[PDB]
Structure 1
Amino acid sequence: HRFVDDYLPALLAQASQLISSEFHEVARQHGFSVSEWRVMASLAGSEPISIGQLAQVTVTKQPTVTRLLDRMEARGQVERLPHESDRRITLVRITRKGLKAVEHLMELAREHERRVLEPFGLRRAEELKQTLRQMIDLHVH
């Protein structure tokens, strides 16, 4: 028994790094940076979301997200717009061009996830996803 062997933050960080690194290699081989992939995948099939929400789901600092959106909007892959009510809030959406650019990569991402989860079986896979979702929802600001 070493402290790190069963310390939750260390376990989450290692599992996340290893799984994400595998798929990020595929994304780069398909011409996407990790940050572009995270943004487009987070916006695909979504209503417009705030910059702060996008930063949270992409685990990226908000100033970095803003600069990324500057370049992604220049390339027509995303669009920023004002919020219906509070204009201290900028919303962002994926465009059709961005969705078409990322659709095949998303199918590859689903295949990779299926391979990662297959050894665990449907019950354990769903339990993992449910626990992770509940943890996120309890700890998000």
Structure 2
Amino acid sequence: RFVDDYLPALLAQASQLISSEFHEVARQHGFSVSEWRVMASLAGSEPISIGQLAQVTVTKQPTVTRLLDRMEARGQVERLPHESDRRITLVRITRKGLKAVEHLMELAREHERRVLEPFGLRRAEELKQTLRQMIDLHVH
């Protein structure tokens, strides 16, 4: 069975299953999946470019731009010029956005702890380290 041990299929299924669990919680708290991904990805961050945000939220950049249009209208994020090279727009979370997602972020930490608890701290840290190294090797 080709797919049983094919890495991209394993990553895709694990990602879908784990994310879908928490996305149900996010929607019960009034967030769409894309709104949660953006706010979670900007929380605690310096301003980042739209392109960086699209990568970390695994969302196409034109979709991110339309999303930021309405989230900025709601005062949850702010777009800013890149002071130097100004073909680049930066984006940050506002205080209003952070307060809006703070409780959901604690629920997200609790869900993650539950997902990882059966594996133990060693295997959990290994997994996160390998995933981080893979991302940094393949990000364009």
Q: Determine if the TM-score, normalized by the shorter chain, exceeds 0.5.
A: yes
Deviation string, structure 1 residues 25-53 (Cα, Å, up to 9, x no partner): 00000000000000000000000000000
Counterparts of residues 1-141 of structure 1 (less than 5 Å): 2-141=1-140
Shift of 1:123: 0.2
Flag structure 2 segments of 5+ consecutive residues without an equivalent: none
Q: Could you say what secondary structure the match of 2:87 adopts?
A: coil
Runs of 4+ residues over 3 Å off in structure 1: none
Shift of 1:84: 1.8
How far apart are the structure 1 equivalents of 2:108 and 2:55?
20
Q: TM-score, normalised by structure 1?
A: 0.99
Deviation string, structure 1 residues 97-120 (Cα, Å, up to 9, x no partner): 000000000000000000000000
State the identity as a percent: 100
How far apart are the structure 2 equivalents of 1:40 and 1:6?
34
Q: TM-score, normalised by structure 2?
A: 1.00
Q: CA RMSD in A?
A: 0.3
How far apart are the structure 1 equivalents of 2:114 and 2:139?
29
Q: Could you say what secondary structure the match of 1:32 adopts?
A: coil
